Amino acid sequence: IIEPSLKALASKYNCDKSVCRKCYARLPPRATNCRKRKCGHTNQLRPKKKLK
Amino acid sequence: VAFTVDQMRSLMDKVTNVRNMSVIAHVDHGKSTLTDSLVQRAGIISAAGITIKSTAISLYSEMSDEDVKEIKQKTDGNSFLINLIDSPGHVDFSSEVTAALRVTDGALVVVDTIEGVCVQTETVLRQALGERIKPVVVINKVDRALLELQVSKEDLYQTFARTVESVNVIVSTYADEVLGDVQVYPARGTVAFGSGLHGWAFTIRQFATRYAKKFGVDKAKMMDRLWGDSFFNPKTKKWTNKDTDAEGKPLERAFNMFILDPIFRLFTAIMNFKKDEIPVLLEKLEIVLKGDEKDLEGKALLKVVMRKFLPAADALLEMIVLHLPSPVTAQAYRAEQLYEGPADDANCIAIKNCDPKADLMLYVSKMVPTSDKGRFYAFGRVFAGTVKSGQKVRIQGPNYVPGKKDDLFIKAIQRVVLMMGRFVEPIDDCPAGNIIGLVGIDQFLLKTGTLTTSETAHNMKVMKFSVSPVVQVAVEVKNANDLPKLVEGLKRLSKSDPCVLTYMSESGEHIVAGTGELHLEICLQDLEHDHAGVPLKISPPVVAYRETVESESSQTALSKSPNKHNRIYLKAEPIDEEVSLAIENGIINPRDDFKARARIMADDYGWDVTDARKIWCFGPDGNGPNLVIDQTKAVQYLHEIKDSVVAAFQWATKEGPIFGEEMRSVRVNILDVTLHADAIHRGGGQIIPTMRRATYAGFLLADPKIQEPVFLVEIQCPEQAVGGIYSVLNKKRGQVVSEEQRPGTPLFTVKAYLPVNESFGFTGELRQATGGQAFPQMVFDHWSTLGSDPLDPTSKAGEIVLAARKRHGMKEEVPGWQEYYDKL
């Protein structure tokens, strides 16, 4: 009820990224840094849990 | 509309003028409130919040003669009887669904507009497919697709196109080929629509005939010109077989135009308060307002506007007589599976012809209980013949076979009654195909049961369910002075639910096996407030473990008397599953002739004929897979010792040294025993605790291990949901035996051995992992040995006996062969 091609468009700005492994945050699946200071610009990520 | 008790009996005799069916529904799509509108609308009365139980509700069908003039069946008249049973919803209650299917010929399909044909729809849809029963689609909640959503006309057309085409799949895959054209398409007017909470419903065929006049085109070509590649032309006034014209401009198919367009203009006008369309479109579509119906507004006003256009009974009871099959031509291909016995047989042929005066056949699927302080009724369809108030009916049980007794109770009926949704009436008879209720058969039959009158007639089908009572929970009392109420309440829950199963545990608890948590929990609070009515203590179900050995004893066992005189030297080893099986199954008996008994165990089980013609016993209780093989020769008084040695052995094999439980695969080969000279030092209070301490050392030296019970669960589910299930085995040791299926059906029956310890919530996580799509079929298969050490309070086997000895109030430590050993 959302169309397979229109669903890739929804993930393109809601979950198709990577989560910070310290304070967690949305950053591209190719990006390799953090935009925060609580870590001091770290490199801890993971391709945001592909939920099924 | 009220009808006297006799008007019903006259209505009952006309099989061509009586439709018997059920309701194929999902959890919540609108089937209970849809059928509720047919009663307060056109329902037969007696002479003058979840689905827990069902009954066959009755109504009157008063049609037009030219209406029954297009029904392909033998029929003479328009005085029909609506004998519909309100089939239970959700899941875990797919028990009463197999029972409502048995006491009917067709079924009312209740799907949704947006939640289309979900899991429970195709579950009860694939249920009707294997029952040779005919399906009839009715998409309810079409108004929610235009109120909370507000869908367009051509968009809502492909919405029902999807719900329909998805049913053309479930059915054209699991159906019978002798039935042929049984798939419901609104192309013949076999799929209904409407709204149950507002009291209305309609069909394409209703307005096809209703507008056949306004176009001159008969209802058959009118509705075949509404659906398909049929588009009208409001420019030239031609119904063209294309979506565009010569200009290449957009057309709205005949359906959305003449049918739907009218209804939408009603919504926004009535609902949003536009009296510039109320009386206007009222007369444009041939409708009228009257009294306080004119005084209502919006939501409540559009309800009465449908009661003025397409009330309930309209499209509902219409497709019931026109396309639904009555016993006449229905049981004319149903007799086969419906009755388990010879087809070219006397009573079998009588049902295919349907003789209401000949061979009396009446299988009661579920015996319907009451507020009559514990007594019930026997709800069953009368296949052939007429049941009277005090007739000699043969109460045949599900075990009975033509040629013996085995549950055969031919008794006379106390009184006969009629079922009306929740109302019983003191009646007299009921014919071939129609269903009624008879009191008094209960105090003779057990839950399900076939009832004949002929000796050569076998038994009628007793379900097959394909739902299985996989779940199991321990049940007891919270006060021992009322334990008697506990067992009696349990006995009535058996004759209460058709798919429910009550049996005693190997430990000493009361096991309750259900289809699921919901099913079980409902029958637990019903057994809490009704059946029993006393406080229960329910905890997880405790398992029984047979203490098995995995090799021969590291040294020879030694143990004598506490008085000190005669000693015992046995060497306990493990009996292979195949030979230990020939004991408990029956190929080598403990009372068999030792001569030819030894001949079979040597050439087919690979043994020494010496120790074989010398078996002392099988155990425990004289027939288990634990033997006492004679191997000594220096024993002059052989005839004064064998007896009491096997005596403490029957107490040793019945009571184990690890945690007070039996053993399995323990072949005790006795090498030597120090005999005496008199029976004063070889008797009663002598040989008992002697062989007792002797077997303790033998088992604790041949490799101690805990053996547990294993299942054979075949979960039937399509190949598309299999992903989640395969990982539930990679979760709680689901070792696959095989995986078989048919060339044209996705539904996969998967064989996997399942551990009792890894089944304390198996059913819940299984439908959660792959939707309700996963149907578990649990049935115990074999006993598989663990692999860990039971004296290790940290290994698999040891963890079990740690918590097990703490519960009995026994010793916290696990005593070895050192503690029970007699040495110099």
């Binding site: 091609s5 890739a8 | 998805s166 799949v169 054209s172 895959t173 044209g744």
Partner: protein
Amino acid sequence: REKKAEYFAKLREYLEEYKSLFVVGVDNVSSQQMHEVRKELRGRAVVLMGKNTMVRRAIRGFLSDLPDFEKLLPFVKGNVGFVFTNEPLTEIKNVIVSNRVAAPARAGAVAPEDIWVRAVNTGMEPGKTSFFQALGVPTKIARGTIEIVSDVKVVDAGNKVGQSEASLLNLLNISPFTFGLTVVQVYDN
């Protein structure tokens, strides 16, 4: 540049023994169809796809083996390579201008023309009807086999191919995002 240096030497050796060659351009190829077209001429015509090793071949068209490299050299654009042979031109032209064959819908690929499809049966069992389900097209049960009720124009002229629709398109054998292995330029002696 180990292999860059040894290939320069390679192309020159073949370019001397033969007098007939073709500037075979592509980009719309397939690992399968490509290597299997070389099988077609494993002794009549062998392919040798070049690159910036061909800008070095501008400095090789500067080598003066036979400087007619003027009417050949600048035809270095698109996935183009070599085609060595010593038989007549129209005979080998028919062979290579027949040597190019179809490739499937890469679900999200370059959609070029509008596709129509007759309202008949495909003779397959109704299991792929769940895909025609979340799209919206009536499907009849004829002998049970999945039947298309419309001569439907599903894909429009030039759009982004959706993953879902191009999958059931592979079920109809639809393949237009391709060509094969043809030619850009010819030249003899």
